[PDB]
Amino acid sequence: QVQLQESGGGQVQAGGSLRLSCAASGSTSVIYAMGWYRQAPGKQRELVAAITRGVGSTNYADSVKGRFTISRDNAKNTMYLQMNSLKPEDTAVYYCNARLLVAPPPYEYDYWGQGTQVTVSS
Amino acid sequence: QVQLQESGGGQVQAGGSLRLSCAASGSTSVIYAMGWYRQAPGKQRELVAAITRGVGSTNYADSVKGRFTISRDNAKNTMYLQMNSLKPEDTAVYYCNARLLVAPPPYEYDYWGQGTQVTVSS
Amino acid sequence: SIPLGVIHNSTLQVSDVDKLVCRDKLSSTNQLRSVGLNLEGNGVATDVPSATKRWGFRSGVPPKVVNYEAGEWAENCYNLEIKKPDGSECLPAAPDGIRGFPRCRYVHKVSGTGPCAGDFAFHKEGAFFLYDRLASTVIYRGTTFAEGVVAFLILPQAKKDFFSSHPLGYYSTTIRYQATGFGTNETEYLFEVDNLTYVQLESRFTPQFLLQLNETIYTSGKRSNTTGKLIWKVNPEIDEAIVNAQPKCNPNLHYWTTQDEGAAIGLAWIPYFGPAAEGIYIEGLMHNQDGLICGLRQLANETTQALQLFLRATTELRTFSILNRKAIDFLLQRWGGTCHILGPDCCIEPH
Amino acid sequence: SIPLGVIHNSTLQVSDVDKLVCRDKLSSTNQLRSVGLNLEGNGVATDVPSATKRWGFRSGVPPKVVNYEAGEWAENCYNLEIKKPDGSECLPAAPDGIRGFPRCRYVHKVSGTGPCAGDFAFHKEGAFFLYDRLASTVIYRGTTFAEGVVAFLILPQAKKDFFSSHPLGYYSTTIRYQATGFGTNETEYLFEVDNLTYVQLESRFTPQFLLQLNETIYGKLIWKVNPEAIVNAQPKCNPNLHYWTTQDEGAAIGLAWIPYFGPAAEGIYIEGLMHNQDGLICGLRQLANETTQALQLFLRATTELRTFSILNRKAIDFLLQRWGGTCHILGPDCCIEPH
Amino acid sequence: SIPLGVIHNSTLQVSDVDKLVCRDKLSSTNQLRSVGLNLEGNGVATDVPSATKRWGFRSGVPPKVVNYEAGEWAENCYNLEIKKPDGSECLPAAPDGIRGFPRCRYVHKVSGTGPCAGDFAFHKEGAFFLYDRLASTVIYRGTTFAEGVVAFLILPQAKKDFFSSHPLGYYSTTIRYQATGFGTNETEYLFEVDNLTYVQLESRFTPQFLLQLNETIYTSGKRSNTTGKLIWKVNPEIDTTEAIVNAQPKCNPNLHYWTTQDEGAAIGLAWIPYFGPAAEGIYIEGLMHNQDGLICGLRQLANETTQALQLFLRATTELRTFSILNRKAIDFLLQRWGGTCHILGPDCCIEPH
Ligand SMILES: *[C@@H]1O[C@H](CO)[C@@H](O[C@@H]2O[C@H](CO)[C@@H](O[C@@H]3O[C@H](CO[C@H]4O[C@H](CO[C@H]5O[C@H](CO)[C@@H](O)[C@H](O)[C@@H]5O)[C@@H](O)[C@H](O)[C@@H]4O)[C@@H](O)[C@H](O[C@H]4O[C@H](CO)[C@@H](O)[C@H](O)[C@@H]4O)[C@@H]3O)[C@H](O)[C@H]2NC(C)=O)[C@H](O)[C@H]1NC(C)=O
Ligand SMILES: *[C@@H]1O[C@H](CO)[C@@H](O[C@@H]2O[C@H](CO)[C@@H](O[C@@H]3O[C@H](CO[C@H]4O[C@H](CO)[C@@H](O)[C@H](O)[C@@H]4O)[C@@H](O)[C@H](O[C@@H]4O[C@H](CO)[C@@H](O)[C@H](O)[C@@H]4O)[C@@H]3O)[C@H](O)[C@H]2NC(C)=O)[C@H](O)[C@H]1NC(C)=O
Ligand SMILES: *[C@@H]1O[C@H](CO)[C@@H](O[C@@H]2O[C@H](CO)[C@@H](O[C@@H]3O[C@H](CO[C@H]4O[C@H](CO)[C@@H](O)[C@H](O)[C@@H]4O)[C@@H](O)[C@H](O[C@H]4O[C@H](CO)[C@@H](O)[C@H](O)[C@@H]4O)[C@@H]3O)[C@H](O)[C@H]2NC(C)=O)[C@H](O)[C@H]1NC(C)=O
């Protein structure tokens, strides 16, 4: 329904900037909070960024406040994480979730993309 | 529907008196104004006398006023023109009409007899 | 704010509610009456081709009724049985309390088919339909009625000179019609002479004339059994209130009203032994005065606007408490409170 | 012109408004009440054979209904289910507001076939049929009634001891009969104890005696058994008045005021007894008789289906007559005392 | 014994009928009025799952009806079409004079089945159901109503400030629900957007949310499938996005009233019923927000009055009552000038010159 897809990741130097994109089709009305999560190998999943569908409020982690920006185009059904000032600790697989509100009788919720690797080289 | 049959015409001396009769059957009651018309050869048809069914009012022409009298018997379905003081100008065919009021879907109205000849000899 | 009139020395004065005049003497509720006056006494045409064009069909407005206590003899009355072309009825059935007009001379019974746009039949002029001491605003199916207006009144000291005594036979004939295209401007009427003979109807014909045609046809037409309906056609050839606003006001008033109580004492008070529903009225005539009763005819025409507005506001199906509300207001105006022993407001005076 | 009575010092006298009575103090509308008194207390026969002769059928007269606010316990009540020989019904169905008469000791149920000449059933003597605070002139089908009359009163300064307190438990028995030829003089009544067994009726039988016959007896079978105002007009007057009336508005206090958590249609009434005085109530019975002559004529003139506003009209007439207008300090018309 | 209130310079006090005060100046019957204030302004929960819990079924009590003249705008109104499981009806048909409540913002239309153990539906709290100037104690089938209370009142006669002027058209949307097991504690509701698509309904859902959940589903809810009816369940981790004194949990300071137009106000040729406004064009709107001490005084007074009104209705035998105010006017006038009232005495408060 809200089939997600990450894009834009790859190898990139420390201190640079990168833009990650997450897109969805199918429904895209029912979505309520697109976000950004990350997993380093051997580590638990921790929050990175979050934005409400109506751009009601944006939330960022303390380790990422002031360097990351989360935005959206509305009439593209897309969402961007434009970020700056990389450090090697950000080398991990970045994921976007699309937690929606209503959902059909399967009642699954919290849709999840396959993730895209971001590698920071210093 | 009210067959008008006149009677009493014929040859008569000038200055005498004569009675013309006109009878009808079939409907009778619907009759509204029995009357009298006259036609000399080569002349147009002109008024002579008129009486309403209920003896409401009698009307006479100026050339004949004071000499003619129109009456009726009601319970005989007949009408009489008793006339006096003949003159040769009255030599003509006399007609009785029975113009009635309602009439059925043929809507003909104003019935006519075949006319009787009154000849004044001087 | 419906006006009411006060009678004094055979003179009618429309009373101003805020004037609080002290001349009128009220001592009981027997002095408050309501009168229903017919429209035909105002000079309007009463033949059915023209009396029908004042009647229309509307949907979306509920009906209301009022009661009146005294009436007036009606020369012409109507009775409708209109049906749709499909076969469905057009007029509502009469409620239980509704009955036909008591006193009629000629009853114009119309039955046929035509378009029926709305749900109810209303008067295009604003008047009422009177059904035996019940003035309505909608035509009911199969009940005799006469169109008129209602007036509210105060009798002087109740000397029984009004509506109780006559200062100085009932026979009604039914005339049956047949209409097609009812409710429209392209309509046709036929005076039903009998079961197979009809005569085309026009506006010039009067009820006395029609009854003459009924006889001259039956005694002469011989009614040949050609079978089928034949339509006959008459040979086209020969054959302080001012009233002057109304074209004509009738100088006489020939009224009927309900029994004056008392009276019947023998054994007739028992409903089982009493009179039927039509033998309870009284009769009278008030032709002596002309200025009074023409003034009454204008008062009912003046008060019909405020009566219609009041009926729209209320939510009662049947209204009976207009006069009691007037009496309570009268007492509350003058003895309402704190009145001066010498003042225009409070009528009490020394000695 | 309805006669009304005034009670003062436990004495009853009719009110002559023409003489402009000033003793009566009408302080409020709570002093105006109408009471329905049964016709049986006057001494009439109550058995079915002699109580049927007083009802007759008529057509062409519309029915009328008036209300009453207080009543009296009825020893005998009647319930009719009569139908035509062809199966058609004779009596009209009771309207929505009509309910059976409360406080009946015995209920006589008569069912059968007989001629029905008229549309409605009327009382031959001019009295009323009482239906739970709604008096009517016609009989409805299946509804219990009791023959009685209606009187109008002015209470003494609302002392609340009258019709609210008794100056000085309900069990109803059903008695079933079967009738043939109802409405005429040739009529037969058979008392049914158990479907296939009947007992012929006699004019001297009492409601009690019919009950012991149920025990006495033990293909339908028929058995034969061989055992100011003066009330001087009435053959008998009851010296006791066991009344009922609608509840006091101030009586209910608890949570039961909610219609959902409330008493049923039969748990409303309040009962009492007024046997201490004799001249007062036997004066009430004659006043109730005398006022029916004018009440029937009033109902005939009006076009109202059910009349609820007779007392309000009386209060308006009293108040438009005494303070009518422009009266005098010394004038006797308005009974005003300067000092 | 029905209490009534008297306004004095925009201050309300329950009339001291026991103390029998004659400072109140009653002049005419135009000065008596009744007002149908509704319960929603008292702070009660109005959502369908919790509002239904206040109505129950009873058999053995006849219904009664009371007339009221003016009213107040209602934000939420109800419309029931409950039917027995076997197809039998439960709610009685509305009589001829009953009409739907005017000036409703949202109309919650409820349909479905449920056991019906009584003849009529009553209010458990003791309030009324209001149908267009006719308060009733029972629910009729298919007619819009709003629950509330009625108060009787005596106005000033200065300038007809109340219910005739503004101290200083409309759109109603219908919301359709489906209910099963109505009238019991096991009832279940579903909000209907079309035939084969429903959403399970909770208590926290406001009508603005339901209209939004409507719009989102039509946009991308895959209604164009032939699978059958489906039930949508909202995620459970997202929020839904004597001088009277007042004792209610909340009182609404403002009052938005409608009333029948004045008889003298209309002047155009619209008094004829034929050339006249329909049943929805009669009313006249206003807004009385200048004072809040008086308005919350009104709400408490109607909260008290229903105790005596319900007992008066039980005693009477009339189907519809229109003569409460006339009886008060007659009673007031029989007590003051009833008989032999002394000039010097304070009971008959007349003045010497
Ligand atoms: C005139 O105004 C009054 C005041 O606003 C209206 O009063 C309401 O009446 C209803 C019906 O009787 C009451 O219903 C009950 O509510 C209970 C729940 O409590 C409510 O109030 C709680 C606050 O505390 C209350 O009790 C304390 C006790 O010390 C009081 O001091 C305090 O003042 C309160 O009254 C709230 O916390 C809570 O959320 C509630 O709002 C229910 O438990 C109770 O249930 C019984 O009845 C049910 C219905 O029959 C039944 O299903 C249950 O099984 C159970 O038997 C009942 O519903 C209201 O409480 C009361 N209002 C308030 C705010 O208390 C009055 O209705 C009004 N009249 C009209 C006609 O409008
Ligand atoms: C108020 O109080 C008065 C006085 O008690 C009461 O009057 C009685 O009731 C009515 C009059 O309204 C009247 O009824 C008639 O009674 C006769 C009875 O016949 C017997 O009458 C004598 C009574 O003492 C008795 O002694 C004689 O021997 C006689 O037999 C009865 O016959 C009438 O019925 C008719 O019968 C004839 C014959 O078959 C029929 O032709 C006719 O059509 C009737 O059917 C009728 O019932 C009664 O007599 C009055 N009693 C007295 C003592 O005067 C009022 O009725 C009461 N008012 C109300 C409203 O209740
Ligand atoms: C109280 O008393 C007054 C005064 O007597 C009555 O007044 C009459 O009211 C009727 C109804 O409104 C008026 O009727 C109108 O007739 C018009 C035809 O012309 C009139 O005037 C000319 C001369 O000016 C004359 O031919 C003759 O007097 C005519 O009567 C119509 O055109 C009017 O409207 C009709 O046509 C239009 C256009 O098609 C439609 O829109 C209308 O619906 C309708 O069909 C109208 O019918 C009449 O003129 C008034 N008379 C006077 C003297 O003023 C009140 O009716 C009465 N009130 C009551 C009884 O309640």
Author numbering:
A (entry chain D), B (entry chain E): 1 to 122
C (entry chain A): 32 to 199, 212 to 282, 502 to 613
D (entry chain B): 32 to 199, 212 to 261, 271 to 279, 502 to 613
E (entry chain C): 32 to 199, 212 to 284, 502 to 613
Cite, word for word, the article reporting this structure:
The GP protein of EBOV guides viral entry into human cells and is a primary target for neutralizing antibodies. GP is presented on the virus surface as a homotrimer, composed of three copies of the receptor-binding subunit GP1 and a trimeric stalk formed by the membrane-fusion subunit GP2, which also anchors the trimer in the viral membrane via a transmembrane region. GP1 contains a receptor-binding site (RBS) that is concealed by a glycan cap and a mucin-like domain (MLD). GP2 features a fusion peptide and two heptad repeat regions (HR1 and HR2).
The structure of GP-ΔM in complex with EB1 revealed that the trimeric GP-ΔM is engaged by two EB1 molecules. EB1 binds to the top of the glycan cap, burying 662 Å2 of surface area at the interface. In the absence of EB1, the glycan cap density is not visible, indicating that it is disordered. However, upon EB1 binding, the glycan cap becomes ordered. Unlike REGN-3470, EB1 displaces the β-18 strand, pushing it aside and exclusively interacting with the inner β-17 strand. However, EB1 and EBOV-548 bind to the glycan cap from different orientations. These structural findings suggest that, similar to glycan cap-targeting human antibodies, EB1 may inhibit EBOV entry by stabilizing the glycan cap, potentially preventing its cleavage by cathepsins. The results showed that EB1-His does not bind to GPcl, whereas EB2-His retains high-affinity binding with a Kd value in the nanomolar range, suggesting that EB1 interacts with the glycan cap, unlike EB2. Similarly, non-reducing Western blot analysis revealed that the GP-ΔM band faded after thermolysin L treatment without EB1 but persisted longer when EB1 was present. These findings indicate that EB1 delays protease-mediated glycan cap cleavage, whereas this effect is less pronounced with EB2. Overall, these findings confirm that EB1 is a moderate inhibitor of EBOV entry, with its activity further diminished against authentic EBOV due to the effects of sGP.
